Amino acid sequence: GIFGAIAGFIENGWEGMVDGWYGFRYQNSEGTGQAADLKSTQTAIDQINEKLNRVIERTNEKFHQIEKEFSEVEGRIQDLEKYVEDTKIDLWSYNAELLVALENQHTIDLTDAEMNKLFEKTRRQLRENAEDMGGGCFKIYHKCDNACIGSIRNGTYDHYIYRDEALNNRFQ
Amino acid sequence: GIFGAIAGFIENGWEGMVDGWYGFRYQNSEGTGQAADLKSTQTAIDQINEKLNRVIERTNEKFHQIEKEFSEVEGRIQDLEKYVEDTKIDLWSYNAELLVALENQHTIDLTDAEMNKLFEKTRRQLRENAEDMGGGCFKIYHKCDNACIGSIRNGTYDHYIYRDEALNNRFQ
Amino acid sequence: GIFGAIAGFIENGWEGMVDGWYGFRYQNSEGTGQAADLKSTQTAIDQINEKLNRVIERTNEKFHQIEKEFSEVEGRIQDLEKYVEDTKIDLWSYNAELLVALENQHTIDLTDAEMNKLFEKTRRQLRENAEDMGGGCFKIYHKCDNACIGSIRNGTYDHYIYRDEALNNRF
Amino acid sequence: NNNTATLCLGHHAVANGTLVKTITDDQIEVTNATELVQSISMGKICNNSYRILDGRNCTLIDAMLGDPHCDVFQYENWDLFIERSSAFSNCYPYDIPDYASLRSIVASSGTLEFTAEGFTWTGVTQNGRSGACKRGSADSFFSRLNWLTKSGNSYPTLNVTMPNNKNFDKLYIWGIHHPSSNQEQTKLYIQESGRVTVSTKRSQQTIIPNIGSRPWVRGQSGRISIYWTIVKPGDILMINSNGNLVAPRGYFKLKTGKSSVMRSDVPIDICVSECITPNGSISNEKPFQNVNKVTYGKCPKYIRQNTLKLATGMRNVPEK
Amino acid sequence: PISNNNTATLCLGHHAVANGTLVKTITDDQIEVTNATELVQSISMGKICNNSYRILDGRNCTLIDAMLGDPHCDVFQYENWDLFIERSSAFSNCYPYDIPDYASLRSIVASSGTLEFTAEGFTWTGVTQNGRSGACKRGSADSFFSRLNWLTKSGNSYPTLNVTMPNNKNFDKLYIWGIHHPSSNQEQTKLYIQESGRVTVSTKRSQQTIIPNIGSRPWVRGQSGRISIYWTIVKPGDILMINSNGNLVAPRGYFKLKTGKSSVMRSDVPIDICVSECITPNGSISNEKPFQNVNKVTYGKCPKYIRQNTLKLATGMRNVPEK
Amino acid sequence: NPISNNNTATLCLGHHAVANGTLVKTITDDQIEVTNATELVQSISMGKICNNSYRILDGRNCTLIDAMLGDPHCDVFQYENWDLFIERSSAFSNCYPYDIPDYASLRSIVASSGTLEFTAEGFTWTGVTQNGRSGACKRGSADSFFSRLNWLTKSGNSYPTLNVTMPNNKNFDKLYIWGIHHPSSNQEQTKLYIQESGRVTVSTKRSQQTIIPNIGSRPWVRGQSGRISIYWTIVKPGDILMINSNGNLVAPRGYFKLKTGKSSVMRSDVPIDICVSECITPNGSISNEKPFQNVNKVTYGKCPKYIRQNTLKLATGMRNVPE
Numbered sequence A, B: 001g002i003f004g005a006i007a008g009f010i011e012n013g014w015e016g017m018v019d020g021w022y023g024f025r026y027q028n029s030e031g032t033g034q035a036a037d038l039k040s041t042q043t044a045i046d047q048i049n050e051k052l053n054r055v056i057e058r059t060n061e062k063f064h065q066i067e068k069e070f071s072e073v074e075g076r077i078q079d080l081e082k083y084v085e086d087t088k089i090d091l092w093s094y095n096a097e098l099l100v101a102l103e104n105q106h107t108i109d110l111t112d113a114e115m116n117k118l119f120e121k122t123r124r125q126l127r128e129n130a131e132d133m134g135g136g137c138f139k140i141y142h143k144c145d146n147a148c149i150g151s152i153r154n155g156t157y158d159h160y161i162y163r164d165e166a167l168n169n170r171f172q
Numbered sequence C: 001g002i003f004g005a006i007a008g009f010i011e012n013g014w015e016g017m018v019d020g021w022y023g024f025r026y027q028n029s030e031g032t033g034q035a036a037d038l039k040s041t042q043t044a045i046d047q048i049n050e051k052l053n054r055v056i057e058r059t060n061e062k063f064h065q066i067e068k069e070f071s072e073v074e075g076r077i078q079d080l081e082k083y084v085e086d087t088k089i090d091l092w093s094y095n096a097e098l099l100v101a102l103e104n105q106h107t108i109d110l111t112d113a114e115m116n117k118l119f120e121k122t123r124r125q126l127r128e129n130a131e132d133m134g135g136g137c138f139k140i141y142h143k144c145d146n147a148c149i150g151s152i153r154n155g156t157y158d159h160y161i162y163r164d165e166a167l168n169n170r171f
Numbered sequence D: 001n002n003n004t005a006t007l008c009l010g011h012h013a014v015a016n017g018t019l020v021k022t023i024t025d026d027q028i029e030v031t032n033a034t035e036l037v038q039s040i041s042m043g044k045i046c047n048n049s050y051r052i053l054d055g056r057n058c059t060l061i062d063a064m065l066g067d068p069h070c071d072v073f074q075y076e077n078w079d080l081f082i083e084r085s086s087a088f089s090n091c092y093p094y095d096i097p098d099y100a101s102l103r104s105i106v107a108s109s110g111t112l113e114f115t116a117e118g119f120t121w122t123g124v125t126q127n128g129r130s131g132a133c134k135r136g137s138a139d140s141f142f143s144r145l146n147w148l149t150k151s152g153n154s155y156p157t158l159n160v161t162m163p164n165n166k167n168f169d170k171l172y173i174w175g176i177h178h179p180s181s182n183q184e185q186t187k188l189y190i191q192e193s194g195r196v197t198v199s200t201k202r203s204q205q206t207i208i209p210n211i212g213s214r215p216w217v218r219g220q221s222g223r224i225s226i227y228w229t230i231v232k233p234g235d236i237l238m239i240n241s242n243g244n245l246v247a248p249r250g251y252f253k254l255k256t257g258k259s260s261v262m263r264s265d266v267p268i269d270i271c272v273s274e275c276i277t278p279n280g281s282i283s284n285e286k287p288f289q290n291v292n293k294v295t296y297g298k299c300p301k302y303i304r305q306n307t308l309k310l311a312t313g314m315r316n317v318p319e320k
Numbered sequence E: 001p002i003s004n005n006n007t008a009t010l011c012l013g014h015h016a017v018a019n020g021t022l023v024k025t026i027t028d029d030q031i032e033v034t035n036a037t038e039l040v041q042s043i044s045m046g047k048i049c050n051n052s053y054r055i056l057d058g059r060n061c062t063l064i065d066a067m068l069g070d071p072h073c074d075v076f077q078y079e080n081w082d083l084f085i086e087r088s089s090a091f092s093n094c095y096p097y098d099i100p101d102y103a104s105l106r107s108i109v110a111s112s113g114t115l116e117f118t119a120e121g122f123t124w125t126g127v128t129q130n131g132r133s134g135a136c137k138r139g140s141a142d143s144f145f146s147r148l149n150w151l152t153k154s155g156n157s158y159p160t161l162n163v164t165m166p167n168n169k170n171f172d173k174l175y176i177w178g179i180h181h182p183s184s185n186q187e188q189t190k191l192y193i194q195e196s197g198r199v200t201v202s203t204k205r206s207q208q209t210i211i212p213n214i215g216s217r218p219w220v221r222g223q224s225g226r227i228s229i230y231w232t233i234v235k236p237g238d239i240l241m242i243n244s245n246g247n248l249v250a251p252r253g254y255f256k257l258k259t260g261k262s263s264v265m266r267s268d269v270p271i272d273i274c275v276s277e278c279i280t281p282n283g284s285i286s287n288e289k290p291f292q293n294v295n296k297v298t299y300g301k302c303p304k305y306i307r308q309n310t311l312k313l314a315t316g317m318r319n320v321p322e323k
Numbered sequence F: 001n002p003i004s005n006n007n008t009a010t011l012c013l014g015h016h017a018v019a020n021g022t023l024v025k026t027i028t029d030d031q032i033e034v035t036n037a038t039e040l041v042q043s044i045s046m047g048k049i050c051n052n053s054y055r056i057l058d059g060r061n062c063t064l065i066d067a068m069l070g071d072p073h074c075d076v077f078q079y080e081n082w083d084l085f086i087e088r089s090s091a092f093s094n095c096y097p098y099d100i101p102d103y104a105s106l107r108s109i110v111a112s113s114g115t116l117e118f119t120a121e122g123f124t125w126t127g128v129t130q131n132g133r134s135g136a137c138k139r140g141s142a143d144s145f146f147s148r149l150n151w152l153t154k155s156g157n158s159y160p161t162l163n164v165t166m167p168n169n170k171n172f173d174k175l176y177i178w179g180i181h182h183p184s185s186n187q188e189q190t191k192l193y194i195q196e197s198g199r200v201t202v203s204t205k206r207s208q209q210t211i212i213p214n215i216g217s218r219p220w221v222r223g224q225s226g227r228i229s230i231y232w233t234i235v236k237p238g239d240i241l242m243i244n245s246n247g248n249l250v251a252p253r254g255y256f257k258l259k260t261g262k263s264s265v266m267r268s269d270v271p272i273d274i275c276v277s278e279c280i281t282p283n284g285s286i287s288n289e290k291p292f293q294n295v296n297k298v299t300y301g302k303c304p305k306y307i308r309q310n311t312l313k314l315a316t317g318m319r320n321v322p323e
């Protein structure tokens, strides 16, 4: 993916994450833990369902048309009738091929996007209290009980509380 | 967007910003201010006009074609005339539907990029004299009058002269 | 491109990099040097190869078709035979124009992406031992012989080993 | 360590992913995908969405004409007429110039509503019959056609009129008889050669007969050629003939129709499906199908690929 | 609470508008952007503009009656068009006729774009020319199609006509001719002597024989008989030949054929002085946008007909209001 | 500090570039330089047709139709077959003048079949002279006729109602070619067939075609004011041909076998030559390495799709940004 998150700087997925497409694994003084991030999951799901809404149960009424099989040999007219259908199919086949390749290319991209967005949403939250260790993991340089992880998860973490403790374990 | 800047880590647009599409708001010892960034605004606008030039006033000459309304019932030759037309229209409709949905998806993604790119351009300029607050805002840890803001905006900010000051204000 | 690396914060290309698409230049105690990054070069070439393979020698057999030039005026049937061909040609010409413009966009943007991904992978390895100077260059705040540079390039650079030394030189 | 924590971000994966095609990748594994190509029929033609008519051993034309074994179809109407391949004609041998166009016009209109009309055929014997066209175990003829012959030693010029005072197009099916010998031409029709001129204000079709032997079919070395004439509101039908006329008995009603005709040999049955093909009905959940290019109703589009997997999840990168 | 003088705050951002507009993308069915632009043209001018392409109003005449020389269509002699307009009020007022493959002839002429007709001295030896009929009133007398010559007997006979006309030009000539079908046997022998006519029209490569067909047809403007019109196209270097011994409605000359960009359209909207390069039956339309929903039948520089009536292309970023 | 420090280093990241880039078109730009690109439109034929991949047949001075009928100068084409038959524009007929209703369809059927494999049959012609000949159709030093047609004429002073039959016991569709002769005058008609007017009726169980002659002058072609008209009948496995004439029949000598081929015909004047290509046009063979082509809409083989554009460069590299 163009953002290098999935199949990239995050090494693999978690089969263990049953309840979300994206989420957290963490370790602190209380043990370790795992939580799903619902908002990113929903953005990626809604996006895919919208592609889906645009193709499934979206067929079109067509009634009497032209004949496409022929028991007799006729020549000029039948040549035309056959060429018309041949041409049509080739053009829809082309279309369908392209549609799926593009949509899939795009589904891979926007799911890489949501991974990246979350990783940035979390980094921006941690300010100077944390470093990117690589692998999609942050080393948080301060005591962080689960309720604190909870505050990071639910977007309420306040870096000014731990900034002094953090800058001090980080440097110097 | 895929970058998560517009309708993402930036809360919202500025209705008060009428002289440009992207830009800066700022606050210092001299007060509050707002100036647009012309280079990005031009980039977004150039890309959109290039789409637009591709489709407005670019139509094909066609002259004598086939009959498409019929007053009499004929069967086989009429069936084929109607079928060919129906086939043509269904296929042009598909192209149109798909083209607009692509262009739009692109337009949204590339204006997000220009926004994110302006952010990144400014982060590099500022080096270790500033910190991403979140919200698309930087906290700059040194005396930064309008002349100094001006510098960032026209790409002439030299981080080196403020560095000693700035390191000091943020890690002490 | 959308990542702003190529034709952006990377000011220009290197005509001297003759064995890679992406890579590194460095200057240290031991001197100056250039090395390609293969993983990044290959990813980019592979993806372009798949675009290419999807459109070359994929032509489809066609045999007896309808007639497309005429030496007599005939009216209705010829009108229809000609309309079907002009209709068919216009549609493929559009397919062709759109296919090339989309791919080309995507190729520009995916080559931009690998340049950024190389940059980010590098940033992440160096942790606190280096600052981004702009231009795609890092200032590495410690002694860094050719062996050490290689360690960065083969993804094995360990930053704790030099952290104290570098934190010193930055503050 | 008690004064540091670790927070890792990630995404899910599955034991069993599925391969899809993208622009840059021929194959690549995602957590989930969905099939956009319908390649499986139901085996049968479903009859509960649209009104389907099993033609059995009758073609749509033979039903229209009134072949005796096609009588159960008098006045039938359909959304889709299904022609079986084992269909056969079992009446007097005939040929129809531009057969496909009539079949199409009948298929299209969707009905065999026939209204008889009070034709006066002064000075001829009507309801001519034949061993080729048994009904009961009695010689007979196409039920919608009136085969006229001499009365005594005359077949006077027939000049009849019939106006369309309706607000729909009338369709008339008539014919000309081509006899096998001059010995027969004269015996049946008196005159040495027929003429049949079916005309309106706008159109006219003369047909001359053509005596001579054709291949033997159900006792007959002769033939009947079938023609049709449409009559629009306000217009008027005129028939002029001094021999060989296989006359009309009435008109068929022509409707702007959604109807059609299909050739299949699969069993009709009770299910529900709004897409019909010669292989049977197919589901229409998916946008495309690879079952048959011949379709009727709400149908996925025919294409040459049998599989197209659309990714409905992220890229799958398993663990260990 | 008071910004330290050795700090400053710098925020980046983008604009937004009051009047956002909804557009469709890949990921979103509807989404608000700062600006859009309609790419589907669903509105016509309700008239046809004459100032670009040469438009010709057929009025009461069809192109075919204009070509044959129906009396009330005399004003259309030598005319030419980029676009011939046929009205639904258009009627015929001559001898009743039919045209096998009418459609094709109409196309062929409409395509050529002209009724430039040149008379040729055909020599009809042993026959009376310029047959006329009360069914075809010119002014206040019996007349006929001006571009056709109805031949009949002279005295006791109608000899076997055998006339030839070489095409020494460098353009394809079109000859319109016909055959009269009498109402009765008496009318046949009265007019032509031979009890059944024959018309063989030939070139070095083609030929067409039509035998007449006698019998009553519906009364139309006095007539129970009919005329059937056929055409023939003689190519440069070739040579027309006509061999009849009854029932021939003769040609008086040829029509110049031209490969050209001209046509014919059925509409009943008025024609007016304006400018437009695209015409439909609903009227002229603007060709600024690339697609249109007004009509499938078009002529000139036209947007492509599609089924959708609106497609908004975004001309601006995602709109995100304050508050 | 001019001399760099021993205790720092500089690591710069970049991409390559070339002195000589090339321009391509994108969504955001009409033109933008990339390190390289591949042209996707073939607009250069080889200037000749290649005869090694597909079986090509030079028709030389002959049409496919003449070759089928057995026009003397086309006798080399007997029992031939082809993937692609090439017709030259300088090809002429040199035998009795004829015309073929729906010539186009017969040409297309035969081309499609891909063979002039003719098998003769025992048509017992009772009571007539066979193998008629004409000064219009020299074979060697002598008057003759199409090799596949038996021109029948009277025996003494009688031409009886011929009634011959011929079943199809094979498992393929037989194609029978036949005709009727149109004389110039009644004098000739009776000289040749006794009956003042003839008639031909060819029939199967399911189909029939009756043709009547039309005596009269046509334009003089190679010594003739008369014409032959060619018709065909296709007979299905199980069916049965029946021929019934009392005058003017130009009889079939047998049948042509029809195949479900991948065969065709193509008009072209370029020379045929040794080389290997699987895509052919009137301009010559083209390479099919590329997906599209601008050479011709007439093609045969494994062909790139005809488009209107002459170049479409596809980017095979990143954006080029020189040093």
Ligand SMILES: *[C@@H]1O[C@H](CO[C@@H]2O[C@@H](C)[C@@H](O)[C@@H](O)[C@@H]2O)[C@@H](O[C@@H]2O[C@H](CO)[C@@H](O[C@@H]3O[C@H](CO[C@H]4O[C@H](CO)[C@@H](O)[C@H](O)[C@@H]4O)[C@@H](O)[C@H](O[C@H]4O[C@H](CO)[C@@H](O)[C@H](O)[C@@H]4O)[C@@H]3O)[C@H](O)[C@H]2NC(C)=O)[C@H](O)[C@H]1NC(C)=O
Pocket: D016, D017, D018, D019, D029
């Ligand atoms: C995810 O797992 C899928 C599960 O498959 C299995 O079922 C589970 C419970 C375990 O038992 C596991 O061990 C099994 O393998 C797996 O699905 C499958 O993927 C393979 C391709 O890797 C499919 O192979 C193709 O099979 C068809 C025939 O399929 C029918 O018959 C077999 C009889 O054994 C049954 O599987 C079904 O009844 C099928 O209806 C072959 O004709 C086809 O051959 C073509 O392709 C190969 C190369 O790919 C060529 O060699 C051949 O010449 C042909 O051109 C394939 O071999 C397999 O059918 C399919 N299984 C099922 C049950 O659907 C899937 O691969 C896993 N996904 C990933 C991403 O790993």
Ligand SMILES: *[C@@H]1O[C@H](CO)[C@@H](O[C@@H]2O[C@H](CO)[C@@H](O[C@@H]3O[C@H](CO[C@H]4O[C@H](CO)[C@@H](O)[C@H](O)[C@@H]4O)[C@@H](O)[C@H](O[C@H]4O[C@H](CO)[C@@H](O)[C@H](O)[C@@H]4O)[C@@H]3O)[C@H](O)[C@H]2NC(C)=O)[C@H](O)[C@H]1NC(C)=O
Pocket: A056, A057, D032, D033, D034, D285, D312
């Ligand atoms: C892999 O990706 C596929 C995408 O194709 C996912 O499959 C879809 O899953 C969702 C949710 O499970 C399905 O949504 C449901 O649609 C029902 C309507 O029927 C559809 O699906 C059937 C297939 O059996 C078709 O026959 C039919 O034409 C329709 O397309 C709705 O009825 C459901 O609504 C409600 O139903 C019940 C009762 O009210 C509630 O309990 C539900 O919560 C729900 O509100 C429902 O919306 C969708 O139809 C599936 N598509 C297909 C093609 O099967 C898979 O989920 C995904 N797999 C994994 C493992 O993630």
Ligand SMILES: *[C@@H]1O[C@H](CO)[C@@H](O[C@@H]2O[C@H](CO)[C@@H](O[C@@H]3O[C@H](CO[C@H]4O[C@H](CO)[C@@H](O)[C@H](O)[C@@H]4O)[C@@H](O)[C@H](O[C@H]4O[C@H](CO)[C@@H](O)[C@H](O)[C@@H]4O)[C@@H]3O)[C@H](O)[C@H]2NC(C)=O)[C@H](O)[C@H]1NC(C)=O
Pocket: D159, D160, D161, D236, E184, E216, E217, E218, E219, E224
């Ligand atoms: C074969 O069969 C057809 C049908 O039976 C015959 O055709 C009819 O021919 C008669 C005349 O022979 C036609 O009658 C003419 O109608 C004209 C007006 O028609 C309209 O208006 C009247 C109102 O009165 C309506 O009734 C009619 O339906 C039409 O809507 C009149 O103008 C004609 O009158 C003539 O005679 C007298 C003077 O002698 C005067 O009234 C006039 O001056 C005029 O000269 C006449 O009445 C009739 O329309 C035809 N019918 C059809 C359906 O075409 C064939 O004659 C017949 N032929 C043979 C050989 O058998």
Ligand SMILES: *[C@@H]1O[C@H](CO)[C@@H](O[C@@H]2O[C@H](CO)[C@@H](O[C@@H]3O[C@H](CO[C@H]4O[C@H](CO)[C@@H](O)[C@H](O)[C@@H]4O)[C@@H](O)[C@H](O[C@H]4O[C@H](CO)[C@@H](O)[C@H](O)[C@@H]4O)[C@@H]3O)[C@H](O)[C@H]2NC(C)=O)[C@H](O)[C@H]1NC(C)=O
Pocket: E162, E163, E164, E239, F217, F218, F219, F220, F221, F225
């Ligand atoms: C219906 O009307 C047509 C046209 O009037 C008649 O057809 C013409 O019939 C004549 C009589 O046979 C044809 O004459 C022959 O035509 C050939 C024409 O080709 C060349 O010759 C001319 C004349 O010298 C050159 O000027 C010109 O460049 C041509 O290239 C000639 O080849 C014939 O030449 C000679 O034939 C013999 C000797 O071999 C002798 O009679 C003379 O020496 C003669 O010159 C000959 O002239 C003429 O071609 C026909 N024209 C057309 C268009 O077909 C029909 O016969 C007529 N039918 C009836 C029933 O009257």
Ligand SMILES: *[C@@H]1O[C@H](CO[C@@H]2O[C@@H](C)[C@@H](O)[C@@H](O)[C@@H]2O)[C@@H](O[C@@H]2O[C@H](CO)[C@@H](O[C@@H]3O[C@H](CO)[C@@H](O)[C@H](O)[C@@H]3O)[C@H](O)[C@H]2NC(C)=O)[C@H](O)[C@H]1NC(C)=O
Pocket: B029, B030, B143, E005
């Ligand atoms: C914080 O900053 C404010 C804002 O003023 C300015 O920003 C600073 C970084 C300085 O570089 C200023 O030069 C710049 O304009 C300071 O308020 C301002 O202080 C200056 C210095 O005393 C005042 O200028 C003087 O004003 C007096 C009395 O009017 C005159 O006698 C002098 O001639 C001269 O003009 C200025 O008036 C004053 N402005 C206001 C609104 O109070 C502020 O002192 C500073 N405070 C701290 C603690 O850093």
Ligand SMILES: *[C@@H]1O[C@H](CO)[C@@H](O[C@@H]2O[C@H](CO)[C@@H](O[C@@H]3O[C@H](CO)[C@@H](O)[C@H](O)[C@@H]3O)[C@H](O)[C@H]2NC(C)=O)[C@H](O)[C@H]1NC(C)=O
Pocket: D213, D214, D215, D216, D221, F163, F164, F165, F240
């Ligand atoms: C012209 O020639 C054909 C072929 O010789 C003749 O057709 C044949 O006519 C005979 C005479 O009645 C037919 O006899 C019938 O044969 C069938 C065979 O199944 C049989 O079931 C009947 O009881 C009857 O005997 C024969 O079928 C028929 N064959 C064909 C192909 O038509 C024709 O009669 C000749 N015409 C003239 C005027 O001589």
Ligand SMILES: *[C@@H]1O[C@H](CO)[C@@H](O[C@@H]2O[C@H](CO)[C@@H](O)[C@H](O)[C@H]2NC(C)=O)[C@H](O)[C@H]1NC(C)=O
Pocket: F036, F037, F038, F039
């Ligand atoms: C750059 O691209 C061109 C073509 O897209 C490559 O050169 C062509 O190679 C192919 C066969 O490999 C043929 O079209 C011609 O033989 C070559 N083109 C010309 C103009 O001679 C070229 O090798 C690519 N790579 C580079 C230059 O590094």
Ligand SMILES: *[C@@H]1O[C@H](COC2O[C@@H](C)[C@@H](O)[C@@H](O)[C@@H]2O)[C@@H](O)[C@H](O)[C@H]1NC(C)=O
Pocket: C146, C147, C148, C150, C151, C154, C156
């Ligand atoms: C990776 O690099 C380490 C740094 O030393 C060197 O760099 C590479 C590119 C070679 O050129 C060496 O000869 C240099 O000394 C190595 O010490 C280390 O072994 C390497 N490890 C792996 C797994 O490649």
Ligand SMILES: *[C@@H]1O[C@H](CO[C@H]2O[C@H](C)[C@@H](O)[C@@H](O)[C@@H]2O)[C@@H](O)[C@H](O)[C@H]1NC(C)=O
Pocket: A146, A147, A148, A149, A150, A151, A154, A156
């Ligand atoms: C955000 O989290 C804060 C603290 O983290 C906790 O969150 C979950 C829900 C609890 O069950 C405990 O694990 C922690 O106390 C909360 O104080 C705060 O109220 C939360 N706010 C919102 C809007 O979710």
Ligand SMILES: *[C@@H]1O[C@H](CO)[C@@H](O)[C@H](O)[C@H]1NC(C)=O
Pocket: B146, B147, B148, B150, B151, B154, B156
């Ligand atoms: C940038 O802006 C400063 C202050 O606003 C101004 O003095 C100067 O002209 C600009 N400098 C350059 C190098 O463009």
Ligand SMILES: *[C@@H]1O[C@H](CO)[C@@H](O)[C@H](O)[C@H]1NC(C)=O
Pocket: D039, D041, D278, D279, D290, D291, D292
């Ligand atoms: C469906 O039936 C057709 C015959 O109409 C057959 O050729 C085809 O292979 C079948 N295809 C299916 C079931 O996909």
Ligand SMILES: *[C@@H]1O[C@H](CO)[C@@H](O)[C@H](O)[C@H]1NC(C)=O
Pocket: E035, E036, E037, E038, E315
């Ligand atoms: C927005 O688009 C409109 C309509 O497409 C166009 O006329 C105008 O130039 C644009 N106006 C603004 C304010 O962006």
Ligand SMILES: *[C@@H]1O[C@H](CO)[C@@H](O)[C@H](O)[C@H]1NC(C)=O
Pocket: E059, E060
């Ligand atoms: C058409 O004909 C009628 C009656 O002859 C006449 O009054 C009218 O003016 C004509 N209409 C036009 C548009 O010329």
Ligand SMILES: *[C@@H]1O[C@H](CO)[C@@H](O)[C@H](O)[C@H]1NC(C)=O
Pocket: E269, E281, E282, E294, E295
């Ligand atoms: C729009 O075009 C259609 C088709 O020709 C027509 O039926 C409709 O009335 C038109 N609208 C007008 C003339 O206002």
Ligand SMILES: *[C@@H]1O[C@H](CO)[C@@H](O)[C@H](O)[C@H]1NC(C)=O
Pocket: C069, F045, F282, F283, F294, F295, F296, F298
């Ligand atoms: C190729 O041949 C065609 C004949 O079909 C001719 O009209 C055209 O001018 C030629 N075009 C080329 C060589 O591109």
